[PDB]
Amino acid sequence: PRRWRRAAGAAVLLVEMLERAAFFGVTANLVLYLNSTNFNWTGEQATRAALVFLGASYLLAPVGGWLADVYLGRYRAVALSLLLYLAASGLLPATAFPDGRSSFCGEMCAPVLYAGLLLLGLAASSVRSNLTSFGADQVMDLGRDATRRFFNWFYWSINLGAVLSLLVVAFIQQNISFLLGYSIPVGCVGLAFFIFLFATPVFITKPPPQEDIANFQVLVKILPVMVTLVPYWMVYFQMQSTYVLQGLHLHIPNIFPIPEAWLLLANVVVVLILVPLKDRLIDPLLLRCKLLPSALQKMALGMFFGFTSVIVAGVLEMERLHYIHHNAAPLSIWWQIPQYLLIGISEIFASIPGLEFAYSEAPRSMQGAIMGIFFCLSGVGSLLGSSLVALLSLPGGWLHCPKDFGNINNCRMDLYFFLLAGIQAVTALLFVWIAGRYER
Amino acid sequence: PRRWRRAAGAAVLLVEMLERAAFFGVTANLVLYLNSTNFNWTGEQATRAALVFLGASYLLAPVGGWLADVYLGRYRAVALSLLLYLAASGLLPATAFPDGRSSFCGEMCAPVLYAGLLLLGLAASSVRSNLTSFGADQVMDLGRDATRRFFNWFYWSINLGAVLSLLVVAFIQQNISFLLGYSIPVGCVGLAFFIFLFATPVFITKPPPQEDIANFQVLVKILPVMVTLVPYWMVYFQMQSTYVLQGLHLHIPNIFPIPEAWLLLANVVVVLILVPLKDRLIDPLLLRCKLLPSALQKMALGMFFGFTSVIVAGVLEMERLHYIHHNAAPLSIWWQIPQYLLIGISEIFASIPGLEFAYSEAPRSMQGAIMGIFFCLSGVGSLLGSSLVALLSLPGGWLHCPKDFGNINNCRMDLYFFLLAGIQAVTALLFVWIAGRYER
Numbered sequence: 001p002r003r004w005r006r007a008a009g010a011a012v013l014l015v016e017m018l019e020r021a022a023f024f025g026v027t028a029n030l031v032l033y034l035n036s037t038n039f040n041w042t043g044e045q046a047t048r049a050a051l052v053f054l055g056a057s058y059l060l061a062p063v064g065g066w067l068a069d070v071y072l073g074r075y076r077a078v079a080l081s082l083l084l085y086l087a088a089s090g091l092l093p094a095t096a097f098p099d100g101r102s103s104f105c106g107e108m109c110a111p112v113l114y115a116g117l118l119l120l121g122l123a124a125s126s127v128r129s130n131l132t133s134f135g136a137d138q139v140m141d142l143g144r145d146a147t148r149r150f151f152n153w154f155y156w157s158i159n160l161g162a163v164l165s166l167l168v169v170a171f172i173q174q175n176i177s178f179l180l181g182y183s184i185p186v187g188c189v190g191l192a193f194f195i196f197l198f199a200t201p202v203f204i205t206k207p208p209p210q211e212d213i214a215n216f217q218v219l220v221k222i223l224p225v226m227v228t229l230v231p232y233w234m235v236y237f238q239m240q241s242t243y244v245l246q247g248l249h250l251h252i253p254n255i256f257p258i259p260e261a262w263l264l265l266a267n268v269v270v271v272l273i274l275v276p277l278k279d280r281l282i283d284p285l286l287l288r289c290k291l292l293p294s295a296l297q298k299m300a301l302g303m304f305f306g307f308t309s310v311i312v313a314g315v316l317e318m319e320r321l322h323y324i325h326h327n328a329a330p331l332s333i334w335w336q337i338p339q340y341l342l343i344g345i346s347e348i349f350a351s352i353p354g355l356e357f358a359y360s361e362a363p364r365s366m367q368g369a370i371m372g373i374f375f376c377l378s379g380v381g382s383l384l385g386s387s388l389v390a391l392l393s394l395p396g397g398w399l400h401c402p403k404d405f406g407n408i409n410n411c412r413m414d415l416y417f418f419l420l421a422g423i424q425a426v427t428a429l430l431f432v433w434i435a436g437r438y439e440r
Numbered sequence: 441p442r443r444w445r446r447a448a449g450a451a452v453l454l455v456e457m458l459e460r461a462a463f464f465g466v467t468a469n470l471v472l473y474l475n476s477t478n479f480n481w482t483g484e485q486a487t488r489a490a491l492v493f494l495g496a497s498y499l500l501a502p503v504g505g506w507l508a509d510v511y512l513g514r515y516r517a518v519a520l521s522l523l524l525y526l527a528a529s530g531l532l533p534a535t536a537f538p539d540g541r542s543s544f545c546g547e548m549c550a551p552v553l554y555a556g557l558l559l560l561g562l563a564a565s566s567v568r569s570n571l572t573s574f575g576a577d578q579v580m581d582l583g584r585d586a587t588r589r590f591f592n593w594f595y596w597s598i599n600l601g602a603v604l605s606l607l608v609v610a611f612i613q614q615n616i617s618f619l620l621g622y623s624i625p626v627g628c629v630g631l632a633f634f635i636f637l638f639a640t641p642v643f644i645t646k647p648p649p650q651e652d653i654a655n656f657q658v659l660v661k662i663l664p665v666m667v668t669l670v671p672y673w674m675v676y677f678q679m680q681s682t683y684v685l686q687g688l689h690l691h692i693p694n695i696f697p698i699p700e701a702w703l704l705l706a707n708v709v710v711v712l713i714l715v716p717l718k719d720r721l722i723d724p725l726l727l728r729c730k731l732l733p734s735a736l737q738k739m740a741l742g743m744f745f746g747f748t749s750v751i752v753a754g755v756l757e758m759e760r761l762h763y764i765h766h767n768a769a770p771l772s773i774w775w776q777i778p779q780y781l782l783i784g785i786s787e788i789f790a791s792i793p794g795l796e797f798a799y800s801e802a803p804r805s806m807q808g809a810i811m812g813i814f815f816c817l818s819g820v821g822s823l824l825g826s827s828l829v830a831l832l833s834l835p836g837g838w839l840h841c842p843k844d845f846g847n848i849n850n851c852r853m854d855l856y857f858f859l860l861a862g863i864q865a866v867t868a869l870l871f872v873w874i875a876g877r878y879e880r
Contacts, residue, residue, distance in 0.1 A: 304869060311862045318854045325765070414758045418858065422751045425865040429744060429872060436876035 017161025018192035058379020061125035065372030233381025302349025309342035457601025498819020501565035505812030673821025742789025749782035
């Protein structure tokens with residue numbers, strides 16, 4: 001933050017959002033190619049595979065980020081991750097040209113796609129973690145309140161990138177043609193790379209025994225606060241789709257003139273609108289009223305808000321069943337915005353304070369490793385939630401509600417929501433206990 | 441515990457259970473007299489008034505116990521409380537003889553009954569608190585593990601006294617006559633007084649500025665751990681009758697050949713059977729496995745078990761509604777024993793560890809005052825739960841379920857149980873946070 005800290009922050013947000021846009025675009029492209037050409041298994045997949053692949057990328061995040069911050073530094077880490085992303089996008093014409101497929105699976109299609117997906121996930125996770133490290137370093141050199149404001153703006157920028165990614169890739173790859181849909185990801189990657197390189201003067205670079213052993217004493221005390229986050233992220237990730245399912249069971253209103261995937265972007269626009277209001281209002285009052293939420297009580301309050309959101313969701317579910325018992329209806333579809341706002345509040349109070357706390361136990365030897373493992377927490381939670389949903393769907397029944405739009409089945413939505421509330425409350429109690437042990 | 445510590449403990453348990461028996465008997469007698477003779481308001485009461493009067497006695501407990509332990513000592517405190525109880529039982533023949541009523545409300549019935557009830561509550565609360573103080577002193581002079589064992593046995597003895605009280609007063613006052621029903625309470629009071637006086641050699645008596653101010657520093661830090669217990673006791677006390685209501689909505693089975701009040705005694709026999717098993721099994725394993733629940737994590741685990749019991753109750757409620765939706769039935773009435781056992785586990789892990797912790801912050805200047813205020817917590821919780829039930833019954837509807845046996849009304853049992861689970865989870869989170877602050 002020498003003189004253009006606003007410019008540096010804007011460049012970081014732009015490159016992050018463009019990287020996310022390219023990530024979603026190339027993932028959708030390769031998934032469509034795999035489902036299309038031969039790929040004997042065909043993946044048996046048409047939608048939602050993007051979520052599980054993002055979870056796998058977060059799963060690969062810890063080791064890749066650790067390698068980046070140990071044997072590559074911090075600037076070379078993002079440079080090489082973006083170069084590997086260029087390699088993936090230059091492999092993309094092989095997906096485009098039929099000669100590429102003929103040369104790939106005409107000999108020893110599947111293995112090359114596996115290698116490309118692995119490299120793509122590694123590069124995306126590494127660049128995300130190291131961009132977070134760069135931004136945190138710059139704004140910690142700027143100021144602590146500035147650090148919190150930048151973290152909120154960074155999460156908001158990630159959400160904005162996800163929204164723009166979804167809309168732009170859908171429009172380009174479904175409206176005009178395919179070659180433009182191939183040049184758009186490489187184009188945004190190239191312009192983000194040029195933005196990054198143009199911002200290298202204002203960016204501050206950093207250089208890459210008993211101290212390593214002492215770091216294990218920090219790891220063994222900071223891990224329990226983060227492993228207990230796995231159940232919370234699990235609950236939140238299945239809620240992310242259960243809210244969409246609940247809205248699908250309701251009668252959508254017709255006001256002011258893909259629908260099933262639109263609620264996923266609604267959950268993102270909710271955060272897109274809360275973070276500005278939060279940044280401009282809550283922080284000044286949270287500083288003048290002296291609540292003293294020193295990066296851990298904020299997280300506990302976020303998970304308490306998540307529990308309250310589950311409470312509101314269960315109340316709405318029981319209200320829906322009560323109307324059916326009265327003797328199909330919107331069932332107060334306009335009463336889902338309060339619970340969506342509550343879950344967005346929980347998300348913003350658990351992610352940004354989570355990053356801030358992960359940088360409280362930062363010490364600069366493996367600062368990116370802790371970010372990689374924190375994102376691995378969310379990845380593990382999403383993957384385990386998806387596995388639980390699959391287990392309760394086909395043989396379970398609890399998650400088989402979408403079939404027959406939840407008319408006659410063993411849906412047990414009330415039971416699922418109540419058990420989810422119990423799990424969230426147990427997670428909150430564990431988090432409070434572990435936080436109490438942490439300060440000791 | 442010189443040589444007959446078993447005898448001293450048995451005498452304390454016997455006098456406590458007999459005092460509770462006389463308490464219930466005389467309360468029922470005076471309530472019946474008030475409802476019967478004229479008492480223009482008539483109380484508008486036939487049953488459940490005993491619970492609210494016990495709550496009022498606990499409400500009077502703090503000030504009376506503080507007076508007892510400040511201006512009377514500890515042995516004179518129980519002596520004078522039992523003497524006041526003798527005064528109440530000697531006022532009882534005025535209730536019996538019509539000449540007593542004619543002399544009471546033939547001039548300036550109501551005021552004398554009010555004074556008698558006030559004195560009875562004061563004496564009962566004072567003797568309960570000071571008996572607890574005596575037992576704790578003796579067994580703390582014996583041993584800490586012995587102190588926990590004695591606390592468990594003391595709660596078990598209170599439950600046994602309640603059961604024997606209910607059965608004996610019902611049988612005597614409904615089967616044979618009234619004069620025997622009048623001599624039974626005075627008889628058990630007299631024999632308990634003689635047991636107490638006969639045990640005075642083995643009993644160890646104790647004698648009755650800046651230190652008082654320093655006690656306020658202890659009070660301001662031990663109160664928050666106990667005020668947060670008010671919501672928990674509130675939830676548990678309305679659960680104590682909501683479980684009975686739920687069992688009433690079920691089809692009772694006919695196996696091995698007042699019914700609505702029998703579940704109240706079932707909730708007591710559940711504790712009557714858990715405390716022996718708990719004492720004989722859990723404590724040795726809790727000491728060999730080294731869980732280290734130093735009188736506070738035990739309380740947190742008790743309230744977590746209470747939350748789990750609410751979870752099981754909600755699961756059962758949703759199961760009951762699901763069968764109705766399937767298209768009255770027992771609805772797994774035998775599946776209420778697990779939730780009753782879980783609520784008994786919560787009660788035993790929240791009361792006995794609660795007493796043990798209240799004696800951890802004992803320092804011997806107002807040791808009985810903290811016991812009086814701890815019982816005042818339960819009294820306030822019971823009274824507030826009863827007020828909430830009344831508010832949700834007549835105009836609310838949530839507690840109006842008993843009318844028409846919950847067939848067609850605004851019962852909202854699912855909503856009530858889910859909101860109760862939310863309140864219990866919030867109470868648990870507050871208790872964990874306050875406990876974390878307590879050790880600091």
